[PDB]
Amino acid sequence: REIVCVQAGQCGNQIGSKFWEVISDEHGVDPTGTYQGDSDLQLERINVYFDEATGGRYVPRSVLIDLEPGTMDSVRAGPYGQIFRPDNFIFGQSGAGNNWAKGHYTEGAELIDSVLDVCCKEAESCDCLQGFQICHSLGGGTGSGMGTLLISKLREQYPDRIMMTFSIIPSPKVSDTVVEPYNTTLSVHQLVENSDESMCIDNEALYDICFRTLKLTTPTFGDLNHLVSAVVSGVTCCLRFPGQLNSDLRKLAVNLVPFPRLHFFMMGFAPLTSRGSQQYRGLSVPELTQQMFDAKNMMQAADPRHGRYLTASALFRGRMSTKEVDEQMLNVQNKNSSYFIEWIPNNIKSSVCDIPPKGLKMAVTFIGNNTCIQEMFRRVGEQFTLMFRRKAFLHWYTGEGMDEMEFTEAESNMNDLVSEYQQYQDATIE
Amino acid sequence: REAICIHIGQAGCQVGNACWELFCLEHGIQPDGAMPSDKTIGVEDDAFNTFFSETGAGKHVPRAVFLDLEPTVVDEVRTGTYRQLFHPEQLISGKEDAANNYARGHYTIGKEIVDLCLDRIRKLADNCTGLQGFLVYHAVGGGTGSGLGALLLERLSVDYGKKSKLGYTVYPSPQVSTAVVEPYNSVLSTHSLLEHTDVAAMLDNEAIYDLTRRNLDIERPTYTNLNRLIGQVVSSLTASLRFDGALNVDLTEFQTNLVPYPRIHFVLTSYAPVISAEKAYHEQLSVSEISNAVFEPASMMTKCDPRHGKYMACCLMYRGDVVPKDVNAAVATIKTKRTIQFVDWSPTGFKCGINYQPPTVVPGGDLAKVQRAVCMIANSTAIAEVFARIDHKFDLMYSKRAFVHWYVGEGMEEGEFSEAREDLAALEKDYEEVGAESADMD
Amino acid sequence: REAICIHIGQAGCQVGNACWELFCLEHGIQPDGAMPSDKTIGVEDDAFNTFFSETGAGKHVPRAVFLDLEPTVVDEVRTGTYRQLFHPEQLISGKEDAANNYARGHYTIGKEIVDLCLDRIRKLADNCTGLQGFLVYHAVGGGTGSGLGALLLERLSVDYGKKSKLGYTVYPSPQVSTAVVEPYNSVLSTHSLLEHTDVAAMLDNEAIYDLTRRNLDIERPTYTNLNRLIGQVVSSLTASLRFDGALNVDLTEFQTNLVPYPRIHFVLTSYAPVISAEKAYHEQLSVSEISNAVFEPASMMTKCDPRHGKYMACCLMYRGDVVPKDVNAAVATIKTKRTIQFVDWSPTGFKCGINYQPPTVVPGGDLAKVQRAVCMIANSTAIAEVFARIDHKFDLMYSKRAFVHWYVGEGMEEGEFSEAREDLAALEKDYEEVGAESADMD
Amino acid sequence: REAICIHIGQAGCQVGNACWELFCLEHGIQPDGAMPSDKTIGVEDDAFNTFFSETGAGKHVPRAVFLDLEPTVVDEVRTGTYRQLFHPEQLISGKEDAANNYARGHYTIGKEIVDLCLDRIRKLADNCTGLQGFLVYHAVGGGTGSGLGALLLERLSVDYGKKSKLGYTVYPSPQVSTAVVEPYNSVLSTHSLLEHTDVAAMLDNEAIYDLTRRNLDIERPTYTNLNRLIGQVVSSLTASLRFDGALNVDLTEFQTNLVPYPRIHFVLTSYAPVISAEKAYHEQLSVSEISNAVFEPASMMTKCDPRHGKYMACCLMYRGDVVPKDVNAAVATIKTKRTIQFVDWSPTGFKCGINYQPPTVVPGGDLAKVQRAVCMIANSTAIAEVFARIDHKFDLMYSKRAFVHWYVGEGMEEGEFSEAREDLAALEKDYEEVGAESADMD
Amino acid sequence: RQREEEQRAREQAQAVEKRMRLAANFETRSEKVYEQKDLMRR
Amino acid sequence: TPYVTSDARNPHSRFLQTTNREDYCEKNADLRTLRRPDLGARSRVLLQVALNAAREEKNATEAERKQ
Amino acid sequence: APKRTAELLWLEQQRARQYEQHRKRVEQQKPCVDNKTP
Numbered sequence A: 001r002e003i004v005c006v007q008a009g010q011c012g013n014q015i016g017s018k019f020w021e022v023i024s025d026e027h028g029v030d031p032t033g034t035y036q037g038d039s040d041l042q043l044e045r046i047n048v049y050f051d052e053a054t055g056g057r058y059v060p061r062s063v064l065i066d067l068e069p070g071t072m073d074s075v076r077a078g079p080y081g082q083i084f085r086p087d088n089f090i091f092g093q094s095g096a097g098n099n100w101a102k103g104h105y106t107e108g109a110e111l112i113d114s115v116l117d118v119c120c121k122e123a124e125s126c127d128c129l130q131g132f133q134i135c136h137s138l139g140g141g142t143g144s145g146m147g148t149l150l151i152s153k154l155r156e157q158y159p160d161r162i163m164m165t166f167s168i169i170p171s172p173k174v175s176d177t178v179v180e181p182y183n184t185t186l187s188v189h190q191l192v193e194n195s196d197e198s199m200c201i202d203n204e205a206l207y208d209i210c211f212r213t214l215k216l217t218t219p220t221f222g223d224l225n226h227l228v229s230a231v232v233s234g235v236t237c238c239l240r241f242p243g244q245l246n247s248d249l250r251k252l253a254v255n256l257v258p259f260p261r262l263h264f265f266m267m268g269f270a271p272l273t274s275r276g277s278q279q280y281r282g283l284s285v286p287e288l289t290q291q292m293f294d295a296k297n298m299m300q301a302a303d304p305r306h307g308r309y310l311t312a313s314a315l316f317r318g319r320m321s322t323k324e325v326d327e328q329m330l331n332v333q334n335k336n337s338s339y340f341i342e343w344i345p346n347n348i349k350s351s352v353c354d355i356p357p358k359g360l361k362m363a364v365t366f367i368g369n370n371t372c373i374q375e376m377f378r379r380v381g382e383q384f385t386l387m388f389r390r391k392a393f394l395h396w397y398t399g400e401g402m403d404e405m406e407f408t409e410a411e412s413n414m415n416d417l418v419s420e421y422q423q424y425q426d427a428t429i430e
Numbered sequence B, C, D: 001r002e003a004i005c006i007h008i009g010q011a012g013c014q015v016g017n018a019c020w021e022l023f024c025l026e027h028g029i030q031p032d033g034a035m036p037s038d039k040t041i042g043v044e045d046d047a048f049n050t051f052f053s054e055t056g057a058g059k060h061v062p063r064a065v066f067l068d069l070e071p072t073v074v075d076e077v078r079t080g081t082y083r084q085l086f087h088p089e090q091l092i093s094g095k096e097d098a099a100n101n102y103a104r105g106h107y108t109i110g111k112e113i114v115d116l117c118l119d120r121i122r123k124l125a126d127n128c129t130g131l132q133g134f135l136v137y138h139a140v141g142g143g144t145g146s147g148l149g150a151l152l153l154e155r156l157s158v159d160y161g162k163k164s165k166l167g168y169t170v171y172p173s174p175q176v177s178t179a180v181v182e183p184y185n186s187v188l189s190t191h192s193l194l195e196h197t198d199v200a201a202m203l204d205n206e207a208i209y210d211l212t213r214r215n216l217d218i219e220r221p222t223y224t225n226l227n228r229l230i231g232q233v234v235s236s237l238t239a240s241l242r243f244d245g246a247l248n249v250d251l252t253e254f255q256t257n258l259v260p261y262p263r264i265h266f267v268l269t270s271y272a273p274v275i276s277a278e279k280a281y282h283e284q285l286s287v288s289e290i291s292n293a294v295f296e297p298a299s300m301m302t303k304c305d306p307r308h309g310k311y312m313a314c315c316l317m318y319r320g321d322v323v324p325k326d327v328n329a330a331v332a333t334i335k336t337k338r339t340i341q342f343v344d345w346s347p348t349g350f351k352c353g354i355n356y357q358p359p360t361v362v363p364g365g366d367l368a369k370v371q372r373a374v375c376m377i378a379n380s381t382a383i384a385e386v387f388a389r390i391d392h393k394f395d396l397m398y399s400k401r402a403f404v405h406w407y408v409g410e411g412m413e414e415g416e417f418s419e420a421r422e423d424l425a426a427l428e429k430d431y432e433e434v435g436a437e438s439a440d441m442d
Numbered sequence E: 001r002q003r004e005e006e007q008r009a010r011e012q013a014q015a016v017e018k019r020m021r022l023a024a025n026f027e028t029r030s031e032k033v034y035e036q037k038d039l040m041r042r
Numbered sequence F: 001t002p003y004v005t006s007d008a009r010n011p012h013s014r015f016l017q018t019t020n021r022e023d024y025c026e027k028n029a030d031l032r033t034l035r036r037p038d039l040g041a042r043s044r045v046l047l048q049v050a051l052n053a054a055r056e057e058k059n060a061t062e063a064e065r066k067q
Numbered sequence G: 001a002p003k004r005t006a007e008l009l010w011l012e013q014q015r016a017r018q019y020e021q022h023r024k025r026v027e028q029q030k031p032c033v034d035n036k037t038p
Ligand SMILES: Nc1nc2c(ncn2[C@@H]2O[C@H](COP(=O)(O)OP(=O)(O)OP(=O)(O)O)[C@@H](O)[C@H]2O)c(=O)[nH]1
Pocket: A244, B008, B009, B010, B011, B012, B014, B015, B069, B070, B097, B098, B099, B100, B101, B139, B141, B142, B143, B144, B145, B146, B170, B172, B178, B205, B223, B226, B227
């Protein structure tokens, strides 16, 4: 059961570099690619993320895409960069210019065939293929446009697999790019049709995690990408280690999605605590559950207290009792009963895996389906409507070839997504 | 003499590990299948034959199949400690799970795996001379256990016909829960199980957690404890086939005595001397004390209170040092009690069994060593409360057709929900009518 | 009780290496031809005589010839480990191959090498006192095997007359293929095999590959494995001449029991306990299980399904610890089965043989060690399907004269294609007519 | 004995080509009308008369007319392979189509052609001696089928009176659609068809597509496949009239047994062993298995679900190797089922038929060859849902007079729409009333 | 029609053979059982 | 900092151990704990002597009666 | 709630009628065991 990863754009390539460092460390893979682990439990599922090259070596099942090779030279120069297969780096000769239309229509159609050829070469090698996993930002240029183009093509070629995405979205307080709302709106329009499950992360939430929980004085993008790589490697842990109650991406989707368009999720990872304080408090299931529902530890700007949970899933890693897990989830459901949708008798799924991440006694990753995600989309739609009434920068997109009708379709689809979440928030049994 | 065990999915394989650990340690078979006999004079007793067959070199191999759609747990059994005990063909594993969908197990994926399983069961049934039933262990909360268990029971029921099928089933606990879609899978499983099973044993994890907290002193139990208790129960019920005794009980006598009407086959289970090693030496454990223990609701492995219903039949299995006169005195005292009530059409409510072999003690176990034990299986109208709560949860969720698109996409007609829900409604009304006093005489 | 083996071409010599390796190790002759004595007092025993003759000094030498047109493989045998076992004149090699042309082997090149071969076969037959047949191993897909095999069988049939000739033939597999011109060579090989052989057993590598993947656990088999299986089959069939047993079977009994009409002499072959060492210690291997195995299509060494036809005769050879009463009970159980059908004119469909010598285990081999085995050769109308696919491929190529100029250049008339194709068509009609029930009574 | 077939418009003529192909191949007449020179006709019996008449020279010609308003399809019949079978007078064609207008067929164009058709039918009917009905093939969605079918049935019904008229009718599927104006034409057709047809069988193309996807293995079906299925159904229903059997069934017993009230004459049809030629050889399929199959919704050739209604009458036709005791056991088992419900005024719900001639296999066909089959005609209240949804679509379009000006220009008062819509509303109320339990109050 | 009778013939033969085998096994076991009782007594 | 999602008390520590290996180890399958204690040396010697004497007398009686 | 159209209203009405029929059959259930006196 093998997963194929796709990394697109600057953010995607950097997060991918940190993710593959974490995965190579957990399975004891040397930066030269040699297996150096010390237990068969590490080796028995190495196939899930690695292919075997001759005489010991392993190569990572990943596709790297970018329009200017600067990032590719940066990842190749990194400490684990050598592990990547040279033929898996695909690049053009001119940038996306932060424009969705260039990335989707002009350089996208020029490079996309070579990416589909590489993805098919990688897909057809698996004995049984599990879903694809993609990381990219929606605010950029090549990440949003070519990522959504490739997602559409892979959904045409492999409609029976799973499509899962990790996505970075523009912060409400400081913009990194002026035209972020257009790229975000067009990308959300593409994702709601093509994706099976989509997870969203705000950089502002990672800064609040770092400042309040870790008390870091001068955080850097390496810390944010480590938190993301930790949770990403955690979601798949039950696929690749033994446990008392196994779980799988399809089983998570089946328990989390009540209706097919409601596939946007919140993310969290529990054991976060500053290096000075950590000597003063031991890990235990009540502490993990209390931190798990605390909004300071959640990777979105929306707060759960303004919405209600339709469904949630918790995957536990470590040697622990099932009694504490079931009774904690019952106690949290009973004490905060107003925040759970009443027409579902139990909203939380639990799963238990025996092998924790290195250096932690126990760990849990949390995935949540909450209507407060509607608040993020409304803010982006507001900024989009403010620029569009005045045709603020539209000539770039129209000169590339976009029909204005595409902008009105994306606006209508995003408004309908916000409305459907709001309607399910205020639904009743009657 | 022989019985074949079928293990399905996650709960069934994990409970199988505890069961086969117990049967090996009780007979004396080593993890590699050999019996370390102390003398050559005399001959080795035939009691193993119910569960093991010997090769011409004297190795033992067990009469069981392990069925799963995901490989991980069976690969863990293949790589664990009992690797050499099981025959590799018996451990069957597919590539991918039924993802909590009954439809995916029954229509799309189990249809590919079912013919290999039937070929293995046929290969076992050809190597028998007195097969007298199938024992099945599975959970109805998950997708592959429900879907493949139903499809496989249907095929065995057509191929083998009259042979009996007794099930030990893990149902969704009344307030502890693990997955959102549990009501749909449990309803659809129960619809197939109603027509094609002779006796169904009901289990709830919340009851075994309560029993392990109150009687034993374990604050943080895990599935290995529950599975060891279930293995002890199965060993007690099957002991009547394997060892000498005053009053033996064949599985057909079990079916004849406990089931009054062909649909009324769901039974409650309890076990008496659940006690810790430190408490066991301060107290005597006479027959009357454990007989009084089996009727208290604190002893049950299903979360239901029998004071809200009526008993129809009880089957009491005693193993160890017991004398029939003490069993008679105990049953007469129970009959005197005012809080125990039987339906007026069942005057002779009890079946007894007495076996001489006392229960075995497992090195890492948590139960004390005791000279005698009693196990009870009983038919009671109180079980109607479990179905009423599953059906109520189904009605709340089905009112918005929650998650239904998964089931329709994997191959099932929407009509099957309504048919199963109407059949379970009829079973609830059957339990209402059978328990109604015959005050009207015409 | 002597037999002479004739090996032709590449497949026949490579299969010969495995056969003679097995026969040496089974009798106990060392690679240098000497048999190391075990007991100081007593007779020497004489069982090798079917395959070996001893000199007055006690060296053993085998009754075989190796025939090839290219030197490489026979020179490898001359330089290999068994250099001293064979007499050097017996290993005959020409200068150049028949280049996948049956015409080149039959007309141009085999005529030069054939007279040395006839002189050696005559010198062997003069050194006999009981001869009961020639065994021939060849492939009909290649040029020298087809052309020189046909020419030599014709010369043998004139010179030796009544003596029996039993062939083991590798026919072109139904979808695995190695060369383009296989249909022409196989069609032309037909008449030679039809009028110049007494029983011909047909093998296809795709079936033996399937058997080695499914039953043994070999992911990447090579020809040495297939050749070792063929050697085991030949050893099982000739064991009846060499060791003590309850029911012996002479080679003439095969022809009497298996051939109803003089052209209907093509038979299917299968072998039962093909099993790996890890599975072998988990299972008993009784007579009824291996008897049930030889009738399953997963056991055959030829790619045909007998459920699409009717059996005319079966010959079952049991070797090892078997008792005749169990063989009779097994055959009666097979007769009971509804998926096994015999033509209504053949009521007594079986011939049995029982030998006490168990099958030998080869140090580098892949088969497990087992106490008993059964081998089957059977005549069935399903074999007609193999010819229909050969005829379709020939018709496709011959419709446009795809390669005929090579054959016409090497000496053959174009008329020979149509004549051979009509003879094989008549053989297909014979197999259609013989299997038709006698519903018409006059 | 005799029956006359009337084929109207495009669907009816194209289905007729498949029907007469099948009936020809089943009796054994050549495409030129002559019996084979090799057949011995051992029965020496007049089996053709149900569908054919013979000339004094022994040529056969069939009892059918082909009626169409456009030339192209009938010219295809005149120039095809069966050119010599039909008498040229039998193939009647007008000048121009009814352009999907019921009004054009009924008022403008069919009025010119109708007297030739009536004269042809008269010429057929005087040359008969035991005529027992008309078979009519048409679609109610198109213009000529609706308008000329209604006009011709009205004239036939006045002239011939009590004589039976049986229609096979393709109604517009509930979401597959081919033209915008289908609801208007189907309502106006159904108004005439209610009074002037004795039994009407309903088909929907989306259901036959679903059946061909699930049971057959056809990825890209076309109308010829559906027409081959229809031909098989018609051959199954009329075989009981034409060949020897244990329980024969004349066409007049259907009306007496199936129709409770004179308006309630619309019946559902389904067919059991729909299986593809490549596979399904292994399953023999007992009577009870195919009887269980005909009640599954995957077997029906009309898209309606009978679990939402109650059966009023069933007619079960078994064809092939069936024994009456097995039919009786199967029907009693069906009657036992709880998800199958009959209206309380119809206790004896079933009619059976058993014929010895197995179904014929057509050289280009897609069904497998099978020894037995069962065919069903059934009366059920579920049909009321199809009319109600058609009426809703009519109401939706008519609320804005979406196309009415074409119809008004071609000749109809607006009142005629409202009259027909009120009559179909009354038909809905009849289906409401027949399904009313109507307990006896006192 | 004869096929059903023939199948019944094999079924009856198999049944009676199984019964005789079980009886023989019972006798053979019983002998050793009572012999070792006697040895224990001594 | 390198201590994000890690513990500074015991970093570089991975607990590669599953539940079943600890729960169904070879210690729990040992049959030596289910055997009743062995007799004393004197009782073992006397047991051998008595068994041999019983065997001899039974064989002598069988030979005397069945000749 | 989404915009009201003809097809959506038809589907909702038919589905509500379906649900009402299903509920009516659930609440009007008849027995199957035979406890009647001989
Ligand atoms: N008592 C007990 N309950 C168990 C055990 N394993 C799982 N369960 C329970 O059974 C239910 C889960 O069913 P599973 O067996 O995991 O479902 P499955 O058969 O794997 O079906 P799929 O998920 O589709 O593969 C939950 O209620 C678990 O609590 C076990 O070993 N013992």
